[PDB]
Design a protein around this ligand. Sequence first.
Ligand code: AR6
Ligand code: MG
Length: 337
Amino acid sequence: AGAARSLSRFRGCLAGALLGDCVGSFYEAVDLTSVLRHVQSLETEALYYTDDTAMARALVQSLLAKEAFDEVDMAHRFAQEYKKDPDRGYGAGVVTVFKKLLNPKCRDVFEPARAQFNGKGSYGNGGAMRVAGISLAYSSVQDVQKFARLSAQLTHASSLGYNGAILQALAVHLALQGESSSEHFLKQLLGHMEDLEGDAQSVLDARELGMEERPYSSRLKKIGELLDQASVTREEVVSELGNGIAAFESVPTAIYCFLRCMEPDPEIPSAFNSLQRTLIYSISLGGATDTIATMAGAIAGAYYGMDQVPESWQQSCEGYEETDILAQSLHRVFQKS
Ligand SMILES: Nc1ncnc2c1ncn2[C@@H]1O[C@H](COP(=O)(O)OP(=O)(O)OC[C@H]2O[C@H](O)[C@H](O)[C@@H]2O)[C@@H](O)[C@H]1O
Ligand SMILES: [Mg+2]
């Protein structure tokens, strides 16, 4: 709500991400009718957050402590946050990275991520699940891309992983700018991803995994088709975009959820506002619901602002007040209000 990159959008962004994580986590690894029954419960801090929020908080606290990106600080905050509470539902592979980073002999904090999965790097969505803070801290598209990539590379060295983090950060960046058509929003994202996926390293990373050339671009083109298609079913969405833990099977899906739900949906009750129905729709897709909902929620919260964050939902979430203070701090320190 209000001006581009306003305090309301900053607070709404991080609150939306927390709601998606906490509420989404109920359904991780799902039918439209019975989701609507579950949010009835939310009509305090009983919903625990997961690794999505834990790593987002460490990322933001690194940015605030150094008033800049500092790979050693952030890498060590990721590792110490894991050491402090390892039971948040971290990916099975990424824990190896944290353990390597906990060794004081580790002098290049990017190298543990590069050894993952036979030296090809992770393409999991962990780099994207946490990246919204980057777009709160950085105004420029150039800086958003630069530090979404770097923050992700601390754990996700595959371009399939960090290009999902960039896409998700670009989406939040665009949402923080305010009102747009769904087609203009999508078109801008398509342009950026077409540019990034023209890079030789990206092409090789994708051909090695047997995927199409420009996987994110192809999925963003499918979003545009889906947005023009009649009677789109959840199975159709899952089949074309995915609902899994790969970044390329969850980040475009999160974006689709946001774009679709910019308009009312007769199949979800009018009493839910735009942020609420975006989260409800995301969870109804099943699969990796907490990360898809957390990412859709970050985009929607930045676009719709704090006035659409419902207190009853927010106050069910573990850490919601700290999440809010961190949002306000980013706005003070980086948006320099
Ligand atoms: N190159 C690869 N080859 C094969 N499998 C892979 C590869 N990369 C990832 N995977 C699979 O992807 C998995 C995750 O990769 P990880 O890097 O451990 O962690 P994350 O931070 O991305 O978290 C992944 C999500 O899952 C949880 O719900 C979290 O909350 C996240 O939402 C691996 O275990 C592999 O099965
Ligand atoms: Mg999680």
